[PDB]
Design a protein around this ligand. Structure first.
Ligand SMILES: OC[C@H]1O[C@H](OC[C@H]2O[C@@](O)(CO)[C@@H](O)[C@@H]2O)[C@H](O)[C@@H](O)[C@@H]1O
Length: 404
């Protein structure tokens, strides 16, 4: 019979690729359908370029793609409209904000699978050791704590120890970290939902100068090459006081054999001042049926299974990844395993989106501009002032004649 072929999460990041293969295999066994899993590069922008080769070819070789929250506007022509396959009641079981994100000119491109938000991981053992009772609420506090703890851990012989790790590589992940920096300084959303390119302002410039100030000081020099996993690996070995990352890192750090099991918490990322907005960049992945799949019915069935209550539950319990169904946030087993889901749910609901809605099919060009200009600040090539001016000009060229 048919072989349903799935381009799912990458095996190069955490456990999500192995887990998703196992879920697809379980669906295949449950339904008596042959399945195959197609692996991906780690970084989301590299994954998009891979999937675009299949789509440009109208290839029937992949039936189901796991797609980023930032992609619906780009990928819509390559997606089977799911709307006729779901009742309204089924659709209302997902957060409406994500269903809306996934809907482009009325086409339901994809089902919400798991959401994501940037958060602050912190070593609570080390905060206590050094006389701190809460994680930092301001970036100034984060810097002061990092400097003091670093000075002590280094003095005590840990030459690998750093204050903060984050995603500073030139790729999409830096756009996510930089939106948090800019927004949490009162610098705006880089491109506002109404289309105003707002990034050339002194608050955004400051945010980027501050991040430069970390590099080689409280963060490693090499942070300018770090993606999710490079950051995670320094953190997880016990060598960083703080890390900015997504929720998936929590389960991994609690696993048996993790050096930091039981030694950390999570909270909202800090901000420049009490009246700035909390910043957590909205991430997450959706499930798309290819417009080129020869087997739409079977592929839709698989996508509904993967998005189902019990599979999202398993994702939350085993991999600490965030459901797209509100009902899971009141499930006793989900909350017993991840009590921090309760405390941070509002942070997750208030997550700030990158400008994918307003940039539409041009988002990947806009994001490339953002990460390259930001990266040039982190490397010390440019100051924040110049970078936000240059970024404004690049985004104006890219979005010229684009209306949302
Ligand atoms: O790098 C930006 C990108 O980060 C997240 O996706 C990448 C991987 O992170 C996960 O560990 C989930 O947290 C994996 O499942 C993903 O493959 C984020 O979800 C994206 O929205 C974002 O563009």
């Amino acid at each position: 019979g048919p072989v349903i072929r799935v381009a799912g999460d990458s095996t190069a990041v955490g456990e999500g690729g192995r887990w998703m293969k196992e879920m697809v295999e379980a669906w295949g066994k449950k339904t008596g359908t042959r399945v195959e899993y197609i692996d991906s590069p780690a970084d989301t922008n590299d994954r998009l370029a891979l999937y675009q080769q299949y789509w440009a070819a109208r290839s029937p070789d992949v039936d189901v793609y796991m797609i980023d929250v930032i992609w619906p506007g780009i990928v819509a022509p390559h997606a089977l409209d799911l709307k006729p396959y779901l009742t309204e009641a089924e659709l209302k079981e997902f957060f409406p904000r994500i269903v809306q994100n996934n809907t482009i000119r009325g086409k339901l491109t994809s089902l919400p699978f798991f959401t994501d938000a940037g958060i602050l991981y912190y070593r609570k053992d080390l905060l206590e050791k050094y006389g701190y009772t809460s994680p930092p609420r301001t970036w100034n506090e984060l810097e002061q704590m990092a400097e003091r703890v670093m000075e002590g851990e280094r003095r005590a012989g840990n030459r690998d120890f750093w204050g903060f790790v984050f995603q500073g590589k030139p790729y999409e992940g830096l756009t996510c970290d930089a939106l948090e920096w800019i927004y949490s300084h009162g610098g705006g959303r880089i491109v506002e939902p109404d289309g105003t390119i707002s990034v050339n302002n002194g608050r955004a410039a400051l945010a980027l100068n501050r991040a430069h100030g970390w590099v080689g000081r409280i963060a490693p020099q090499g942070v300018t090459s770090y993606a999710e996993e490079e950051a995670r690996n320094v953190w997880q070995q016990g060598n960083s006081l703080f890390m900015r990352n997504w929720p998936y890192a929590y389960a991994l750090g609690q696993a048996e054999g993790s050096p930091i099991r039981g030694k950390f918490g999570v909270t909202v990322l800090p901000k420049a001042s009490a009246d700035a907005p909390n910043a957590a960049t909205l991430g997450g992945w959706q499930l798309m049926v290819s417009a080129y799949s020869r087997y739409p019915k079977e592929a839709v069935d698989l996508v509904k299974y993967l998005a189902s209550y019990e599979v999202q539950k398993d994702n939350a319990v085993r991999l600490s990844r965030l459901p797209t169904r509100p009902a899971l946030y009141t499930d006793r087993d989900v909350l017993a395993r991840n009590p921090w889901f309760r405390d941070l749910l509002p942070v997750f609901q208030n997550a700030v989106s990158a400008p994918s809605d307003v940039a539409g099919a041009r988002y990947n060009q806009v994001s490339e501009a953002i990460w390259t200009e930001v990266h040039s600040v982190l490397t010390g090539r440019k100051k924040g002032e110049q970078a936000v001016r240059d970024l404004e000009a690049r985004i104006r060229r890219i979005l010229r004649h684009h209306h949302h």
